[PDB]
Input
Amino acid sequence: HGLKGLNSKLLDIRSYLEKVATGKLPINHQIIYQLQDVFNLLPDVSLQEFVKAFYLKTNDQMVVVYLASLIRSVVALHNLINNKIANRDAEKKEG
Amino acid sequence: RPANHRQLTFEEIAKSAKITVNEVELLVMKALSVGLVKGSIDEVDKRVHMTWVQPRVLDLQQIKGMKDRLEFWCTDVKSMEMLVEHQAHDILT
Amino acid sequence: TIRDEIAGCIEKAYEKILFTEATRILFFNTPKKMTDYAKKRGWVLGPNNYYSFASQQQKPEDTTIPSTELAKQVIEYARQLEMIV
Amino acid sequence: NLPKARAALTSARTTANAIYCPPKLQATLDMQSGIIHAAEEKDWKTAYSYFYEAFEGYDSIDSPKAITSLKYMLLCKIMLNTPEDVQALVSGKLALRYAGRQTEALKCVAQASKNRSLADFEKALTDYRAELRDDPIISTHLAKLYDNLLEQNLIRVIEPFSRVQIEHISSLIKLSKADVERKLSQMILDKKFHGILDQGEGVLIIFDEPPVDKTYEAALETIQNMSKVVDSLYNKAKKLT
Output
């Protein structure tokens, strides 16, 4: 998504600079800059203008990290306990 | 401007548009019906907040201003996108 | 080693301590040591008093940057979830 | 004297079944059971139901005793405010039989129970003061009403907008700090009201926000998991040594 997203970004921005140079028309017009400005709801440029989205950035990662911390704790309790149980039952009772 | 810098202070509208404080309401809210900006207004500090945008035409300095702040999104993201490709390619294989 | 602690220990953080109150610990009468403190500390030299302005001091926010490194913490954290896998 | 009333009622428990036919005892005992138990404040509807039972047993008896029977049962509808039996009794053919003067004032008292409406309740309070005197307990009947009807008009004023100034919102109840705001502080304790006050600037803030969902569903399961390992510690030490 970064590759195919930003390669057409560079291919077009070089042809859009070529406009002033040569190949005018296409002017276009106007479709080029119009939806580019719809892309401009967030630029995102220096730096990210996330002052409102900063605390919200980690706040979306809030529960994702919490559950990942909560699941791996009990999944271990399912994995660690049950493995030790069944292991020593076969291991030591055989010899 | 690249903004945001989205919410705007009434004194700035009172500078450019040179309109009095009591008339800024009718001004910016009429643009809400026209459709050039949907941004609601914050009336506690009297600051007019913007949403979306209305593009109009283009200029030679706009393309040069584009390549500055457009490709900057291309060079910043792909640079750290390689960091996502670099470290995490081992856990995928 | 005790004398240089009068500047280090007493603050941070106090508001304002009077002239002769600091002299009670430093003894002497009007030594050049407290005069060297007015230079070294800086801090403040007030009339008949000393001030901690401004303010108390430097007013730590502390920073809005660590939101960055919080995303860095999720990098290796999500990687550890992929190591199990 | 409640214990002496119940002791006289307890002796009537074996007295009703002692003779052959009561002829009316248990029905009267039911009304007496609607007095001490009502003084016990057990259940408002069941005690009111005993008046309905006594009213069914009051048919074809002395009218002055029957004309004063509606004094207790229809004014018992005043205390409850939610008997749900309102339309059953008074709209039946048996309760409409009394056209007398004293019961016509009781018929609108039974309507006064359907009224509530503290604007009207404080008005008719003077007109019904005569029937208020015949109330067996004058304070408790109208105290549980006035205390309940208090928040009835309070949930009207506090509902529309989230936060309200505590001085004007308690000006309709005429005072703030002494009882009301302490009773309103008890509302958070009774869960009937979710919010918090401000003593300095006088603004009551209502917040229902702080849920408990994910947390108790986690730690409480781990406390149970403490019984998984401890009970397995017996298996551990037994097989090894």
Observations:
- The beta strands of chain B are 41-42, 47-48.
- Chains B and D do not touch (no CB pair under 8 Å).
